[PDB]
Design a protein around this nucleic acid. Structure first.
Lengths: 49, 181, 31, 95, 234, 121, 35, 54, 148, 119, 238
RNA sequence: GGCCCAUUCGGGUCUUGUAAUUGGAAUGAGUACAAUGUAAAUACCUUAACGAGGAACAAUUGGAGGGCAAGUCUGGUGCCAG
């Protein structure tokens, strides 16, 4: 049972990296830019209503 | 015959095992702390709930009750000695502020991973159950061991362990003999 | 105050010669 | 209660009614008429499957449990042996 | 620090046995022979005390309960050795046969000491220890404090602060490279930089009323304990 | 006023030196002004401890620039020789750095001293 | 990179990368074969 | 200064040794309101002494 | 410009790892009323139900709504004004407290909701990582709180 | 019967005399399967060793008496003791006040009796 | 990635005064008021335009939390060309030079700092930028440097103190416009480490409501920073 | 290519997949020489040698979905549906 839950948990972490950004040690070395690209009009801001 | 005996359960099933939040909580907890099944969390939750039930009883009592100062300061001393309750927060409302992951952090598995003796919680567990971890002079093989501060200090590899200075394991000497032969 | 008040109570709840000491002494002379 | 307070019931297998039915694994294939040993009231029961209909034969003891409408009962053992156990070839039916 | 305990013949200094500590972190730091006995006690940096019998050329037992490297060990005719663990700041006695432990801790804080007065330096570590008696012992800390202990009381019965004095203040010509002297003087910060001498050595003659302390101040100080064993003087 | 500011008092120096030895045993200690400098450059440090009695004190004021620019709390201790003894190293030490590790066994007591350092500043 | 690798366009540097060329070579062959 | 050889196996050891000292004396100049040459002089003789050892 | 709100960093899938003791609860108007019906006093009802120190919090809309109820519900208004009940300011035009609360719990994942209104419980249930408090039977009940 | 555990806990801090602690590894019951002995277990055990040494032979445990002294003493453990510190006394209900209360005949009963105690 | 010889593809951002450099990598980029030099060792683009050589400076989201907010996708920013900006907590020109690049020569950036030791670099950076004015003073006491500040369209707060809401408040009443901009960077560890990250942010949004800021949006700065968000508001004195 | 949300259309996110190959270590159940233990003996404790890649030294239970034939049946508005 232990290894199954281990594989499930590392599986579960990944789906959270997909849904949302997470901190992964921050910048490591020289800044190489946005790897996935910058999108002009997509705002991920949370608007106070 | 002679008098029978009292024994008690260390855990209790939750009210509703089936909230998705609940299941995701055991998933996070077993993954982070390498727990075998849900019985360990049921045990820890039961024990913590008992402590909190006592603590709220004392918060109910008026300050300077003999019962209150007695029972609560005893609780604080014990929770400090197990290492869960820090020195600077010796008061019952902070006893009311604990969370189970502190108790899981006090599990010997967590220190074996944390101190650097093991590269993972599961590696810590296999090392412990395999008698490679000694608390001072004594070999311990239970991951659920609750480590004290003074016991936290003295975690090491056992003298009899191949990693602590004993002879190489069966595999090493077997391969060495085959290489020589 | 209450801690002491417990202490006198135990003292109350709890020519001068001890039978056991006399038994230990012969054991020591035996030693 | 279906069994008058009991959880299970004995019966004697009288006839496999749908044995002639054409469509394989049919619900009508699936029904067997069983006479309760308690009171002589003839009733019908469900089996696990057309393979498990094949273990059951007439005049053998069968254990019944609550489950084509009109049929409320399920056969769980035959001659003191579990049908599921026979189906997994984990046991042999005693004659 | 070679993680070995080599026994030498007194007459010729020839090696007759070598006893490894069998620990990577087992550097020997203090050795104390039981008085008028063949028992040897070895305090190591592995946070353990190892017990040997020299006539036996064998290791006997390992003792545990220090919370930091064990710098000094002292023993008398009895098997009640005393040890100090440096930064753990705990003076400590053993019974080898029972294996049980005494824990002694100083517990002084400059805030109260200044108040009851109304320079005191917090103790950093206990580096030296010597047994004046089977029931009494003394220790020296890195705040210049030498403390008298008894088995009856966990806390010190008597303490003598800044025994060896305060270290010389750093020179103002080296404190900073600024030309103006007044600029350099501010870097001295008055007297908040000043620190005390450490008690590098502390030895008490067995079952006597005098003991000697040592440091790099340049003088050996001899102290005398009171008849009642409640205080001492220089 | 002094370049040596803030300077921890006798008590606070003790708990800080408790951090350095225990961090040293756990391989979470980079000691010295030079290797203190990189840890700031990589942003991997909780805080940098320095000695106020250094001769000259000048040789460590490049570090606070990096710390305060990087919002890293810092403290000075009166003695370098005492600091070096805490590093587990046979020589005086003028600067030291505790590195960022939420997976460390001593997280709590570091963050304990963290809060007192921030109050001091 | 060296001055020799610095070029006028983004494009022609992509050619100087041998790893990019082999990656492009292999897939075109697969795409033509299925086509 | 490794592109124009400002500080220039044993030769490299002096360069790194001098570089560490140069990184030092830069500090004493920058963070002192009126820097002096007293520490620079004793810093250079230390470089000098190292020179004859190697 | 198109806007896609982030999912809160305090939420692990559907488990909220931020709400920890002491808790903060938003009180709806019905909850004070139903609390009085069951003779369940406000603060202990969370203490015994949740076994943690609880910081009750009421909005201006809820304070406004309790006031407009009328003389029939005086004790409900008073009880909202107990000192241990803190107040939450609002910067929006409407006094409709239901829309005010859903925004806050949508907005921020550190609150428990205390309500029994039917329209509200379904809406908040859809919001992930939000515990729900309600009064039923003889004492309060907490549905979506892993720590219990 | 009068003794209740935590009053001695205060005494130990307020005694100002050391408490004779034992070694860290010496206190595991059995390889971790049984937690650290509670403080009580270390006194009742030493009563046996102190009681064994003089008599010069061991004490065997009767098959019957074994059935109320071993399990429950270590089932209270897994139910109460966590890391070798007892938590059962906390849940249990006892009249703590009576044990400390000056119930002995030498108690304040009239104004003079308490006036004597000031003197 | 962005290696010296390669070429990049620079275009405007949604927000005025901000640009994006496309290519194999996407870089948040803005122009240089002082071409030919970098303030904190940041990397710079050169574009030949009719031919004059215009230069641009890269924004690192990890170093600058404002740049992290852009990557997070802040909906509306009051910092823009031709707007006065009053930036608090000016450790150095790591972000002030970037905030300057947005406002342009027409605007100015009012940089406020407390400690002297960073101020020397802030003053030196201010020389290269004729619009940046360093006001090295305690932001807890705006009255000390009311002498120095003409009015401001937006106030940005980089100050990491427990009482930052009070610093932002006192500055906002004195200097901010009605309907003016307010942008604040929050580190829950600095304010209250005892309670979770989130609840601190709830409390911080509260103060802005009592001293008359209507707050507009918050943005957590993951993956660039932990335990952080950028709350943006409008100062409604009415 | 993997994953997440969404009745609807679609939208959101990035180090991933192996049903691929390969290396050296650790040790438990077992196979067990001894002593100890004891009226003797069993058991307990301690302890030589051997003991893993399908680590075949081969734990289960329950549920949800598939898909395949020169295969079979039934009803149809062909190549469909059950």
């Amino acid at each position: 049972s232990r290894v199954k839950k281990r594989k499930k948990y590392q599986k579960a972490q990944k789906k959270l990296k997909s849904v949302r950004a997470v901190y992964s040690g921050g910048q490591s070395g020289v800044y190489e830019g946005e790897k996935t690209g910058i999108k002009k009009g997509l705002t991920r801001s949370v608007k106070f209503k | 015959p002679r008098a029978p005996r009292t024994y008690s359960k260390t855990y209790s099933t939750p009210k509703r095992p089936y909230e998705s939040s609940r299941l995701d909580a055991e998933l996070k907890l077993a993954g982070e702390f390498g727990l075998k099944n849900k019985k360990e969390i049921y045990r820890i939750s039961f024990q913590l709930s008992k402590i909190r039930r006592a603590a709220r009883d004392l918060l109910t009592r008026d300050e300077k009750d003999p019962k209150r100062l007695f029972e609560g300061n005893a609780l604080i001393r014990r929770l400090v000695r197990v290492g869960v309750l820090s020195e600077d927060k010796k008061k019952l409302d902070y006893v009311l502020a604990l969370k189970v992951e502190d108790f899981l952090e006090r599990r010997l598995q967590t220190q074996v991973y944390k101190l650097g003796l093991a590269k993972s919680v599961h590696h810590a567990r296999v090392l412990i159950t395999q008698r490679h971890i000694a608390v001072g002079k004594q070999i311990v093989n239970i991951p659920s061991f609750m480590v004290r501060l003074d016991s936290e200090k003295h975690i090491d590899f056992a003298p009899t362990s191949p990693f602590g200075g004993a002879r190489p394991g069966r595999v090493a000497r077997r391969n060495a003999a085959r290489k020589a032969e | 105050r209450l801690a002491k008040q417990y202490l006198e109570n135990l003292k109350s709840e709890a020519n001068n010669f001890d039978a056991g000491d006399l038994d230990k002494d012969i054991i020591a002379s035996r030693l | 209660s279906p069994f008058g307070g009991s959880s299970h019931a004995k019966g004697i297998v009288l006839e496999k009614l749908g044995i002639e039915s054409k469509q394989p694994n049919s619900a009508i294939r699936k029904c067997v008429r069983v006479q309760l040993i308690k009171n002589g009231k003839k009733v019908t029961a469900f089996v696990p499957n057309d393979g498990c209909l094949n273990f059951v034969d007439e005049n053998d003891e069968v254990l019944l449990a609550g489950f084509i409408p009109g049929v409320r009962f399920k056969v769980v053992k035959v001659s003191g042996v579990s049908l599921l156990a026979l189906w997994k070839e984990k046991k042999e039916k005693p004659r | 620090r070679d993680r070995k305990l080599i026994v030498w013949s007194t007459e010729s200094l020839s090696p007759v046995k070598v006893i490894p500590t069998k620990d990577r972190r087992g550097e020997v730091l203090s050795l104390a022979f039981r008085k008028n006995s063949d028992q040897l006690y070895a305090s190591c940096a592995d946070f353990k005390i190892r017990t040997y019998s020299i006539n036996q050329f064998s290791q006997l037992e390992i003792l545990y309960g220090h919370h930091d490297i064990v710098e000094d060990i002292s023993a008398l005719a009895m098997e009640r050795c005393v040890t100090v663990g440096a930064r753990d700041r705990t003076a400590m006695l053993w019974k080898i046969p029972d294996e049980t432990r005494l824990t002694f801790r100083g517990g002084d804080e400059p805030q109260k000491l200044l108040r009851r007065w109304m320079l005191f330096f917090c103790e950093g570590s206990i580096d030296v220890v010597s047994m004046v008696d089977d029931f009494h012992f003394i220790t020296g800390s890195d705040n210049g404090n030498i403390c008298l202990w008894s088995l009856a009381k966990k806390k010190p019965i008597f303490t003598e602060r800044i025994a060896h004095g305060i270290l010389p203040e750093p020179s103002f010509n080296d404190i900073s490279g600024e030309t103006d002297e007044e600029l350099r003087k501010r870097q001295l910060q008055g007297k908040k930089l000043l620190q005390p001498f450490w008690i590098t050595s502390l030895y008490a003659i067995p079952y006597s009323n005098v003991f000697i302390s040592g440091s790099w101040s340049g003088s050996l100080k001899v102290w005398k304990i009171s008849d009642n064993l409640r205080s001492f003087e220089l | 006023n002094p370049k040596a500011f803030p300077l921890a008092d006798a008590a606070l120096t003790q708990q800080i030196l408790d951090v350095v030895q225990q961090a040293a045993n756990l391989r979470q200690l980079k000691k010295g002004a030079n290797e203190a400098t990189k840890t700031l450059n990589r942003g991997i440090s909780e805080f940098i401890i320095m000695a106020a009695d250094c001769e000259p004190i000048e040789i460590l004021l490049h570090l606070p620039l990096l710390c305060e620019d990087k919002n890293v709390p810092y403290v000075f201790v009166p003695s370098r020789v005492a600091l070096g003894r805490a590093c587990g190293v046979s020589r005086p030490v003028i600067a030291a750095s505790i590195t960022t590790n939420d997976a460390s066994a001593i997280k709590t007591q570091i963050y304990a001293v963290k809060d007192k350092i921030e109050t001091l500043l | 990179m060296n001055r020799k690798e610095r070029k006028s366009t983004i494009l022609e540097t992509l050619m100087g990368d041998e790893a990019s060329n082999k990656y492009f070579k292999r897939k075109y062959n697969e795409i033509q074969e299925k086509s | 200064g490794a592109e124009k050889a400002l500080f220039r196996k044993n030769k490299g050891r002096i360069s790194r040794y001098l570089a560490n000292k140069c990184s030092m004396a830069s500090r004493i100049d920058n963070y002192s309101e009126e820097p002096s040459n007293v520490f620079g002089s004793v810093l250079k003789k230390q470089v000098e002494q190292r020179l004859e050892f190697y | 410009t198109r806007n896609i709100p982030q999912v809160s960093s305090a939420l692990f899938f559907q488990y909220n790892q931020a709400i920890k003791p002491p808790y903060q609860v938003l009180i709806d108007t019905n909850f004070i009323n139903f609390s009085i019906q069951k003779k369940v006093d406000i603060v202990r009802g969370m203490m015994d139900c949740l076994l943690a120190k609880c910081n009750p919090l009421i909005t201006d809309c809820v304070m406004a709504e309790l006031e407009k109820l009328g003389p029939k519900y005086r004790i409900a208004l008073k009880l909202a004004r107990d000192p241990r009940i803190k107040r939450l300011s609002c910067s929006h035009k409407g006094t409709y407290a239901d829309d005010c609360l859903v925004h806050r719990v949508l907005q921020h994942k550190c609150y428990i909701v205390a309500t029994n209104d039917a329209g509200l419980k379904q809406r908040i249930r859809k919001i992930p990582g939000i515990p729900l408090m309600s009064v039923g039977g003889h004492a309060y009940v907490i549905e979506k709180l892993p720590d219990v | 019967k009068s003794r209740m555990q935590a009053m001695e806990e205060y005494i130990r801090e307020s005694s100002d005399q050391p408490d004779w602690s034992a070694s860290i590894g010496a206190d595991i019951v059995n390889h971790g399967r049984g937690g650290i002995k509670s403080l009580r277990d270390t006194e009742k055990e030493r009563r046996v060793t102190s009681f064994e040494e003089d008599n010069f032979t061991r004490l065997n445990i009767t098959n019957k008496a074994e059935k109320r002294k071993q399990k429950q003493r270590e089932r209270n453990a897994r139910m109460n003791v966590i890391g070798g510190e007892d938590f059962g006394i906390f849940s249990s209900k006892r009249k703590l006040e009576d044990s400390t209360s000056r119930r002995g005949a030498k108690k304040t009963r009239s104004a003079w009796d308490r006036a004597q105690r000031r003197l | 990635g962005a290696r010296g010889g390669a070429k990049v593809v620079i275009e405007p951002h949604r927000h005025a005064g901000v640009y994006i450099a496309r290519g194999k990598e996407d870089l948040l980029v803005t122009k240089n008021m002082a071409p030919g030099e970098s303030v904190y060792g940041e990397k710079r683009i050169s574009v030949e335009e009719p031919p004059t050589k215009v230069e641009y400076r890269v924004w690192n989201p990890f170093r600058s939390k404002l740049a992290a907010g852009i990557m997070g996708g802040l909906d509306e920013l009051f910092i823009a060309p031709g707007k006065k900006v009053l930036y608090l907590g000016a450790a150095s020109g790591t972000s002030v030079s970037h905030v300057s690049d947005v406002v342009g020569p027409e605007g100015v950036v009012y940089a406020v700092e407390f400690s002297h030791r960073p101020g020397r670099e802030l003053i030196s950076m201010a020389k290269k930028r004729p619009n940046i004015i360093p006001i090295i003073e305690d932001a807890r006491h705006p009255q000390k440097y009311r002498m120095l500040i003409g009015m401001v369209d937006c106030v940005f707060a980089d100050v990491a103190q427990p009482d930052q809401a009070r610093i932002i408040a006192l500055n906002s009443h004195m200097f901010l416009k009605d309907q003016g901009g307010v942008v604040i960077s929050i580190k829950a560890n600095c304010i209250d480490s005892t309670v979770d990250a989130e609840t601190v942010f709830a409390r911080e949004v509260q103060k802005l409501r009592e001293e008359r800021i209507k707050p507009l949006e918050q943005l957590t700065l993951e993956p660039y920073e932990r335990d952080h968000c950028i709350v943006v508001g409008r100062y409604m004195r009415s």
